[PDB]
Structures are given as C-alpha cells and as structure tokens.
C-alpha cells in the first residue's frame, strides 16, 4: 500500500472532517487533497517524473503537509530539510540526494542552494491539477542520519505499513500535535498516522514545545503528543501533571529511564504511555512498549515487542538465536525496512543483511544489544560498541 | 565481536531474487533464497565487489 491510498479512503469516507489545523487555518480532508493536487500539477508541469527527488525547506505549517502530499502525488519522493540547518549541511543533503527541485516559502527562499530550482509554494502557476499517483515500490522520502549524514531511502510500502499499522490506535476523534522536525521520522507519526486514521494534524506554534505549551495544546483539544526522550524526561521531573488530559503520550529515541515513566503515571493515571524504539532505517520504530492507564512501570523500561507485521531476532556472535536473559545483537526484520542508503551500496549490504528466518528477506543490524524476557519483550542492553 | 563488523573476518557476498546484495560471514550457512556470488574474501574486498556490481539499489521487481 501507500499512505496516499490510505489517505484517499479517509477523504472519501469523511471529506468535511478536519485534517490539518494551523494557527488560524483549518483544512478539511477534501481541502487538503485539492491543494495537494494543484501543487502536484505544478510539479508535473515542470517536468517532474516518477522517482525524482524533491527537497523541501519549510517551517511547519499547513503548507508543509500539502507539499509532502503533492510530491507523492507527482510520483516523486520528498527530501526534508530543516530550515534551521546551516547552509553547507543543506547544500550537502540536496546534492547527495539527487534532488533537482526544492519547494520553499518566501521566508525560506534564501536557503535554497545556488543552481537548484526553487519552487515557492505560495506562488500560483497555470498548470492544471494532475497526479501521477504513488506506487508502493517507488521511493517515498530520503531522510538523513549521521560522522557525515547519510540518506536512508524508504519506499512507500514501508511508510504505509508504519502509518497504517493498527497498533497506533489513532481514531477520527484524535488530534495529534506536530512539532517534531519533518527532517526526522517522528514526523511520520505526527503527520501521516492521524491522516490515514481520519484524525487531525495540529501544527504546533513556533518555538519549542514546553510543558506550558503542552498544557495549552491539550486544552485546545490535542489528544496525542510525541516528545523526544530529553523533552519527556524534563517535563516528567519538573511538571508531570502537564500530561494530564492526553489520551496517549509517546516518547523514544535516546534512553528513557523507568523513573520518568513512573512519575508520569503517578500524576496522570489515565494517560497511555508508549515507549518507541527504532532506527530511521526501519521507519520511526520497530518495537514498542505500552503502559496502560493505571498500570505501574517496573524498575526497567523495555523497548518492548515488535510492531504488528515486524519481527526481531537476538543473535549471538555465531548468528544463533539466544535464550531469554542472554544479551545479543539485535536485528530487525519484517515490515518497514528501508531500501537502503543512497549512493552507498556497500553500506547498504553490510547493514541490511540476509535474514536466516525469512527466505530471501533482509534484516537491519541495529548495532544495539538486547535480551528477551521470558514472555517476549526486549530489554535494551547498550550499543555493541 | 559482532561477525558483520570484523575487519579481519572472512566474508561472502550474497544476492537475492530482487538483486539486493548482502555481506555474510563465511562461517555461517547461507540462508534460503540467497546465493553466494563472491568470496570468501576480506571485508573490504567483499564491500568492493558490492560497490562495483550493485549499481541500482532499486528492487529488480520494481524495474519490471
């Protein structure tokens, strides 16, 4: 599948439902589709062809969501660039990624590198609305991860498996706060999961989301919010009551201590707390651990169990599966794998290796250590290095 | 030491039906659906074969 295909079901089912809320701007599902179609038409009219990469340099806004969807409708993959990156980093990402065109706003126009076509999203053009259509094997985005940043090339099929996963449990009444950089793959949960579920994406006001802005967002109707491990830890120790009123808070990335989760649960008994784990190479997250309302976290916070449609293996130095309670190398397989690393076939072939448990399939070597619990959860045991 | 990172290890290059290449430690049985096409050789030698011979990451199914 593809996220546009999943998105199309929600546009058909409830076209007048709210899809994106920006400060004074509210876009319904039908309105979002029409805007993306017009910008896609512009891209097709400029010579954009299937598989092309289009860079994106925008601040979070309704225009951002439209741009990513428009690139997909034109058959191309978006290369997200954070407007706050230094110019040499921006220049490197554009050049390494093979993007020949770059969508920007008036405010970001000066960040487009020289020699790269700038496409100003608020400019009109004559081209009719037209869409080539996303396809599951075509590329969906290239996200850079670091010494030097490398581009992880992710196909539509992997993005849709993540975004459409039933485990997210996002429903039409949900409202998800969007504040993560769209250059990072936490934005795939904040943008695409609600849109494939019928919910609304709520663009956070400019600046970092602090506890106060979180409380205010909750008062305005936000029901789910992802925070980086650092942000979750800060708010949990200083103002854990700020999560009150959320249906679910999510966190992951860097290490999260069990103590932080226990503090939140004590202040907010009804809040679901979800720990996410995974690399960009496996689309946002491959495993997760969910603390239900009223439940108390143990002394250790697991990275949890594989998402539906995924598999994990813990292998020793001989590539043999270990028994529970044995620390080994963590490998991720099943749904959500990237195609590989752009321009780096050797790196792809050493990180994305043959999977002995699935014929012809690959697994991603996380470089992390883990052990199984007796009942099939995973505990982090540090990086192999 | 993880076997896939050992620069002094002996390695194979494998290929699946989609044309994707994989490094593989030569001591381990080759999984089903994968064919050995190079090695045993040094890690760098195997990486060089891949860089030389894997010219399109795109799955061979995608191309046709």
TrEMBL record, chain A:
Signal peptide boundaries: none
Annotated source species: Actinoplanes teichomyceticus
Range covered out of full length: 9 to 396 of 2076
The protein, known as: Non-ribosomal peptide synthetase
Coiled-coil boundaries: none
From TrEMBL, chain B:
A GO cellular component entry from the record: cytosol
Residue runs in coiled coils: none
Entry-linked InterPro entries: MbtH-like_dom, MbtH-like_sf, MLP_fam
Annotated GO biological process: siderophore biosynthetic process
Any matching Pfam family: MbtH
Annotated SMART domains: MbtH (SM00923)
The MbtH-like domain, residue ranges: 2-52
PANTHER family (UniProt xref): ENTEROBACTIN BIOSYNTHESIS PROTEIN YBDZ
Protein name (database record): MbtH-like short polypeptide
Name of the gene: tcp13
């Amino acid at each position: 599948s593809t996220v546009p295909e999943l998105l199309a079901r929600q546009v058909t089912r409830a076209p007048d439902a709210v899809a994106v809320v920006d400060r004074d701007r509210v876009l319904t599902y039908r309105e979002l589709d029409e805007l993306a179609g017009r910008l896609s038409g512009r891209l097709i009219g400029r010579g954009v062809r299937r598989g092309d990469r289009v860079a994106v340099l925008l601040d979070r806004s309704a225009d951002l969501v439209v741009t990513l969807l428009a690139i997909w409708k034109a058959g191309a993959a978006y290369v997200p660039v954070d407007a706050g990156y230094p110019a040499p980093r921006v220049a490197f990402m554009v050049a390494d990624s093979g993007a020949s065109r770059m969508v920007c706003s008036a405010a970001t126009r000066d960040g487009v590198p020289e020699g790269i076509e700038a496409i100003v999203v608020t400019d009109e053009e004559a081209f009719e609305a037209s869409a080539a259509g996303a396809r599951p094997g075509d590329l969906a985005y290239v996200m850079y991860t670091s010494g030097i940043p490398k581009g992880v090339a992710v196909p539509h099929r992997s993005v849709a498996e993540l975004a459409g996963n039933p485990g997210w449990a996002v429903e039409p009444g949900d409202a998800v706060l969007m504040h993560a950089p769209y250059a990072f793959d936490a934005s795939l949960f904040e943008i695409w999961v609600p849109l494939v579920s019928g919910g609304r994406v709520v663009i956070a006001e400019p600046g970092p989301v602090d506890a106060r802005r979180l409380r205010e967002a909750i008062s305005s109707g936000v029901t789910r919010a992802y925070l980086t491990a650092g942000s979750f830890r800060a708010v949990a120790e200083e103002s854990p009551e700020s999560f009150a009123g959320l249906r679910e808070v999510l966190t992951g990335g860097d290490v999260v201590p069990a103590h932080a989760v226990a503090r939140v649960r004590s202040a907010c008994p009804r809040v679901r707390i979800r720990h996410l784990y995974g690399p960009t190479e496996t689309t946002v997250c491959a495993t997760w651990h969910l603390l239900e309302p009223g439940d108390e976290i143990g002394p250790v916070l697991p990275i949890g169990r594989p998402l539906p449609g995924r598999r994990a293996q813990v292998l020793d130095a001989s590539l043999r599966a270990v028994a529970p309670g044995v620390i080994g190398d963590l490998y991720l397989s099943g749904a959500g794998l990237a195609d590989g690393y752009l321009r780096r076939a050797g790196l792809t072939a050493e990180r994305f290796v043959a999977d002995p448990s699935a014929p012809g399939a690959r697994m991603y070597r996380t470089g992390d250590l883990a052990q199984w619990t007796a009942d099939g959860a995973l505990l982090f045991a540090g990086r192999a290095d | 030491t993880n076997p896939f990172d050992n620069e002094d290890g002996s390695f194979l290059v494998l290929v699946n039906g989609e044309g994707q290449h994989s490094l593989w430690p030569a001591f381990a049985e080759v999984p089903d659906g994968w064919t050995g096409v190079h090695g045993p050789a040094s890690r760098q030698d195997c990486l060089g074969y891949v860089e030389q011979n894997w010219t399109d990451l795109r799955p061979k199914s995608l191309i046709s």
